[PDB]
């Protein structure tokens, strides 16, 4: 459950948790450990930085 841990307060998206999640933890966009405590929080923050792709993401 992420929606139960969604923070539309800091999250730039106020549509759905899946949206902001579909962004960070979507493989592209602005994935990272930042979205961990940006739109969500642990232990969800772990999923954000988890489903944020590994090397498939736009990482260095």
Tokens matching residue 28: 């592209």
Method in brief: NMR
Contact status, residue 39 vs residue 17, Cβ threshold 8 Å = yes
Question: Which phi and psi angles does 46 have, rounded to 5°?
Answer: -80, -30
Tokens matching residue 34: 């930042």
Number of domains in the chain: 1
- Here the CATH number for the domain that contains residue 24 is 1.20.50.40
C-alpha–C-alpha distance, residues 10 and 37, integer Å: 9
C-alpha–C-alpha distance, residues 47 and 60, integer Å: 21
Burial (0-12, 13-18, 19+ Cβ within 10 Å), 19: middle
CA neighbor of 31 nearest in space, from 12, 56, 14: 56
Give the 3-state secondary structure of residue 45: helix
How far CA 55 is from CA of 33, 45, 52, in Å, comes to: 14, 19, 9
C-alpha–C-alpha distance, residues 60 and 38, integer Å: 21
Domain span at residue 5 reads: 1-60
């Amino acid at each position: 459950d992420i929606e139960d841990f969604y923070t539309s307060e800091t999250c730039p998206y106020k549509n759905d948790s899946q949206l902001a999640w579909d962004t960070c933890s979507g493989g592209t966009g602005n994935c990272g450990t930042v979205c961990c405590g940006q739109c969500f929080s642990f232990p969800v923050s772990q999923s954000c930085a988890g489903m944020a792709d590994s090397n498939d993401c736009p990482n260095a």
